[PDB]
């Protein structure tokens, strides 16, 4: 995506940013905690640009492991 691409994620991973670190940068950590418990909070979080970016980064880091 325009705001978080391939090359930007490579820079984040070189910096040692974990998925959880990036969620904190996004100010999403507490919302994620609420989403694990509440279907309403989950559905709301799932519609966000911030969660889209977070999940993008998560798959990127997994593909660069092992």
Smallest distance, Å, CB 54 to its own copies?
8
What is residue 64's DSSP assignment? Answer: T
Q: Looking up tokens 């984040």, which residue turns up?
A: 12
Closest separation in Å from C-beta 11 to its own copies: 17
3 touches, from Br ion, its own copies, none (C-beta below 5 to 8 Å by class): Br ion
CA atoms within 13 A on the CB side of 40: 0
Q: Which of 23/45 has CB closer to Br ion?
A: 45
What one-character DSSP code corresponds to residue 4?
A: S
Q: Which residues bind Br ion (CB under 5 A)?
A: 1, 3-4, 18, 31, 44-45, 49, 52-53, 56
């Amino acid at each position: 995506g325009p705001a978080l691409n391939t090359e930007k994620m490579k820079t984040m991973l070189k910096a040692g940013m974990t998925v959880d670190d990036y969620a904190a940068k996004l100010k999403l950590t507490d919302k994620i905690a609420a989403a694990a418990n509440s279907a309403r909070a989950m559905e709301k979080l799932g519609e966000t640009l911030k969660m889209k970016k977070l999940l993008r980064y998560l798959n990127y880091v997994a593909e660069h492991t092992a």
